[PDB]
Structure formats: C-alpha cells, structure tokens
RNA sequence: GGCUGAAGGAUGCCCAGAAGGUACCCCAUUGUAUGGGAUCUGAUCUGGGGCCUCGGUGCACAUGCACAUGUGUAGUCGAGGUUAAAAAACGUCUAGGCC
C-alpha cells in the first residue's frame, strides 16, 4: 500500500522540479518509476494532467514528459488479462476535460438559484464573489487543457484531425470562453498546423473570426486577442 | 478619497480609442487600480488634476492613457510635456508609454542629461514626438534654446513633485510654466501631500481636482501562514524536500537572512534537479534586474533572496514563500511576505521554524495579531 | 511454497467496418439553426494481418580437402513479388517450464 503513495510523492516531486531546461536530467528518473498497476497509472496520469492544466507556462515540459511514457502498458485490475496504455488514459482525461462545457453552465445554474437565495447584501455579495471565483477557476482550467492538448499535438501524440474538429467545436460555441480557448490553441499550434494539406479548411477558420472581428458584438478583449492571433498568422507564426 | 465621484469598473466603459485599447491590452492591463479607476476620466475630458498615489504601481499609467487619448495623431509636434524626478524613471515611463502606444503610430521621447546637445537638436528637428518626458532642470535647459515648440503643448504634467521639491527646482518649474501657454491642461501628481506641493497647486493649476489614493500594506487574513515544527538545522533541507514532495508548487521564493546560507543552500539544491536563481547582498543592481526578470519569465522555478533585496523589487505571481529563517527584523516580516497588494488571494506562507525560534513565532503571531496554524499532514487537498 | 516466459491473448503499427466530428460544398426545411447527402476524418469500439521468392554475410552440418562445393537457417542485412493489410519480437498477462 505504501508503494503507491511513495510513487505519488516521487512523481509530484519530479513534476515540481520539471522545467524545460533541466528536462533530460530528470527523464531517467521518470523511466525508473515502477508503474505496474492500473491504480498507480491512473494516479500518475491524474497528477500530470492536473499540473499541466493548472499551470500552462511549464506545460510544454509536461507534454514532453508524457512523450517519454507514450508506451507504458499496465494490466487492468478488474480483468487482469487486459492492458491499458498510458496514452489511452491521458487522452481520455484530456477529452473529458475538453467537453465539460456542455455540463459546465449547468453546475453554475445549480448555483445560480443560490444567487436569489442570498437575501441580504452581504450574502448576495459573497455569493456573487464565489460564483465569479468559480467561473475564473473553470476558465483557467479550460485554457490549461486547451494549451496542453495543443502541446501534445506538436509531439505527434495527436493528429491534425483532432485539432480540426476541436477548433471548429470551439468556434461553433461563440461564447467568450470558447473563443479565448480558440485563440490560445491557434497561438500554440499555428506553425505546426499551417500546411498545404490543411490550407483550404484553415482559410475559412480565420475568415470566420474575421467576421467576428468586424461584428464587434463580443467583448473587446476577445476581438483584441483574435486580432493578435490573425496578425501572428500573417507573420508566418513567429 | 476623490472629490470627483465617478468610480469606473473597467477600461471597457472608459470610451478609449480602439488603437489605444490595443496598446493597453497588448501590455496586459485588465482591471484598473484605484487611480486608474477614478483619476482617468477627469484628464480625458480636459480638466486640471492634482493626484497623489504610490509610484510605479500604474500611477503613471493613468495619465498615460489620458494623454495618449487627448493627443492628436495627425500633427507631428509636441503637444504635452512630462516632468519626472529623475532621468532613468523618465526612460521607464517613456518605455511604458510605448507599451501602450505601439499601435498608435505616435512618438514619445525622453530628454535626459549627459547627452550631445546638437544630437538632440537634430532628433527634434527630424521629428517632434507627440509627448516628452524628462526632469525640470535639464528640460528647461533644453527648451529655453528653442530646440522644441512650447506652442502646441496643451498638457503639462508633473510626476513626483515632492521629489522635484526635494531637488529644490521650484523656480525652475516656475519658469517652465511661464514659458508655456495659458489655457493648457495641467496635471500634477505626488507621492505624498506636503505643504510645498499644495502651494504649487494654488499658483499654477486652476480649480484643482484632488485624487487622494490611500496606500495600504495590511492584508494579513487574506494569506494563510503555516509553520513546520522541524527542530534540527540539518533537517531543514529534508523539510524543504518533503514540502516539494507533498505540495503543488508552481514557483517558490526562499528567504534567507544571511549570506553564507544562501550559497550553501543554492549548491545543495543545485545538486538536486532544481533550477534556482540566487541573489546576494554584495551584488549590483543590473544583474539583480537580470535575475529578477529571469525568474519572472519562468526559466527558473526557485528564487533565493534576502529580505532587503525583495523589498527593493518584488513579483507577486508566486504561489509559495518559504520563510526559511525568521527575520531578525520583525517588521520586515510583512515585507518578507509582501502582503501589501493582496498578493495572497491563494498565496501561502511556510515558516520552517527551528525549535528555539518558536518564541519568535510567538511574538510575531501576537504582535502582528495573526494565527499561525500548524502544517497539516493532509494539506495536499487544502491547497 | 519461489524463479522464468509462448508473435496464445492484450498493447503498439497497418487494413476493413461502426459510433462520433466534419470549417467549406449540395439538398430540405429554410435561419443562418436543425436534419440529410458528399468528401475529409475518426482522441473511441468491433474484427483481420506474423505472407512468399532470391541474393550477401555469419553460423552449423555433410562432402571433397587451412580452403572449396552442397544443404538448413540468424527473431540476420538487403532485392523483389503477393494480400485491403507484411507490424513494437512488445515498460503486459496467462498456458506452461524449472526449484
Ligand atoms: Mg458519420
Ligand atoms: Mg483491433
Ligand atoms: Mg488477432
């Protein structure tokens, strides 16, 4: 029992120490971790994903760390004749995080009634602060998840199709949070996506948000980030 | 307070020009500070404003927005003067205006001393920047020889007048005002509200609008402070290792009072896979700036510092401060934490306190009137 | 009661099919939304895939005599064919096998 907890301690220490420059020296430590049980694998993937979506700046390193464990098979505890690759588990966490938006407003709605139930001014203000704080905690998560997925794409653990059906999904939901995520994703994947095999489809994406740029219906800051993304595209992604 | 009673939520309602908004958002501004909240609209409309707020915390940014909004883009001339207590802060304010005006197409300059006079003459002749920053003495020495245009200037600005009063250039600004026009907008800001600046108000600036920003440094309850009952000095490093093994550390600030321990712990940590940047008391100011910006960017995830150096410059984007050794200066504790700007919305403090310093913990807890909870074993969820 | 490991499963790769997506296009309502179609896909499931033929090298054997020829092939390098598909000899579990 203590082995799993010790493995979690060491994995979290490695994640905290992990930085882009010192990458290689820690990777041996990663390959020397005895991950041989579905519970240990799930916990390690939980730690990696939580760190990587809660702290986008270093996510690059974590992304590359995931590449070192792209092939780490483990036997499922339920049926010990089956195996789960690390990639299948890490991607499932990423996809599950990507589509929480369909339910996300719901939980806010489940708290929205409380806004009415906080009668006095002090209670009303405290409830409003908590719900906006929750909205911040979620928007910070979605952005981290998007950047992590985009970073996994550059390491080829994804393919162009998933990016092309993620960008379109973000864009179809014209709400602010989705457009912010779209800006972040394109900013981090433009160079590795702007190829001739995807030239037609891409040529619509930006054109679409150009209408957004011209509509000014959304908040200014959204337009401003979209202008930054379009200008970065105009300069060959550098 | 503010005799002007329009307190704004954000920049969106401030009716700024779109390009100026692009500059300010490319800089990074999201929510206004108090002087940004209030003291921006008065200077947009054209009123003459007296203000008092902390230096370097976006106080200059407010009049940067206002002035750049009032500047006419078409005319290539100097429409506003800015006068700073020194020359290097003038360079910083020029750079920060460029940060808010790179999309404008306008031009700003920093007329500073120790420079070739005819070089400045030619630079002004080729293109007159829309605004100019500088220091009253050399600014007058530069202007009096007709190297600029004291005609088109329609907003005169003083920043850190208390510092200019310390320089004793009251007559110098007297002549600078005497040179310029009559009905031009005037804004003066100061660090404090002394009697000399108040006398300057009634002499030059008509019908003052007063901005009184209250500087504060007490946000004790916002940030939590825990302590670890480690009693042996050799086990302090093991305690830090355990902390890194049981916490979700983004970046950390390591405070060490002395000098030898700084290099001792730096080498000990560098033996491990950590990436650190360390600052000493015998360092310069320039390489200190290099190290500070390096840690700010994120290429290093540990900043080892000494309290006075962190007082000289601070970054509040850090989610964990290890008070490795409690400071002999008890008051400096609040500086060591750095709670002066509500940095601890989610920020935590850790005191790795040796046994005999439990007494020290006691008098800081009592005198500062706080509550230092003990390090829970199951804090991984609480943070 | 402890050591070890079958291209027998699982995993990875390739192929087929299915759920799902599909900015652009077309068709319907017609409202720029939904549904259907066409490609393009397929973070996910269900199956299938461990072929031949020829050389080089190495090895072993058998002959003649250290050397040569013939034979079989080392998870061998290549060279071509064949099936829609010619794969990580696999950070895995077993059936066993041994003490
Ligand atoms: Mg379909
Ligand atoms: Mg299959
Ligand atoms: Mg099979």
Author numbering:
A (entry chain B): 754 to 991
B (entry chain A): 24 to 406
Show the paper's wording.
Here, we analyze the three-dimensional structure of the J-K-St/eIF4GHEAT1/eIF4A ternary complex by using cryo-electron microscopy (cryo-EM). We analyzed the structure of the J-K-St/eIF4GHEAT1/eIF4A complex in the presence of Mg2+ at a 3.8 Å resolution by cryo-EM. In the structure, the J and St domains directly contact eIF4GHEAT1, while eIF4A does not interact with the J-K-St region. While the cryo-EM map in the region of J-K-St/eIF4GHEAT1 was well resolved, the region of eIF4A exhibited a weaker EM density, especially at the N-terminal lobe, reflecting the flexibility of the subunit. Based on the cryo-EM and previous NMR structure analyses, the angle between the J and St stem domains in the J-K-St/eIF4GHEAT1/eIF4A complex is notably altered compared to the angle formed in the free-state, whereas the structures of the eIF4GHEAT1/eIF4A themselves still resembled the free-state structures. The structure exhibits two distinct binding sites on the J-K-St region. Each interacts with two separated negatively charged clefts and the surrounding positively charged patches on eIF4GHEAT1, respectively, via the extruded nucleobases A724 from the J domain and G777 from the St domain. Importantly, in the structure analyzed in the free state, these nucleobases are not flipped out but stacked within the stems, while both are flipped out in the ternary complex structure. Furthermore, the relative orientation of the J and St domains is quite different from that in the free state. Considering that two Mg2+ ions bind to base triples that include the ASL domain bases in the cryo-EM structure of the complex, these results suggest that the excited conformation of the ASL domain without Mg2+ is similar to the conformation of the ASL domain bound to Mg2+ in the complex structure, preforming the Mg2+ binding sites, which are further stabilized upon Mg2+ binding.
The IRES from encephalomyocarditis virus (EMCV) interacts with eukaryotic translation initiation factor 4 G (eIF4G), recruiting the ribosomal subunit for translation. Within the EMCV IRES, the region G680-C787, designated as J-K-St in this study, is responsible for the specific capture of the eIF4GHEAT1. We previously determined the structure of this J-K-St region by solution NMR spectroscopy. It is composed of two stem-loops (J and K domains) bifurcating from a base stem (St domain). At the three-way junction, a highly conserved sequence of six adenosines forms a short stem loop, termed ASL, which interacts with the J, K, and St domains at the junctional part.
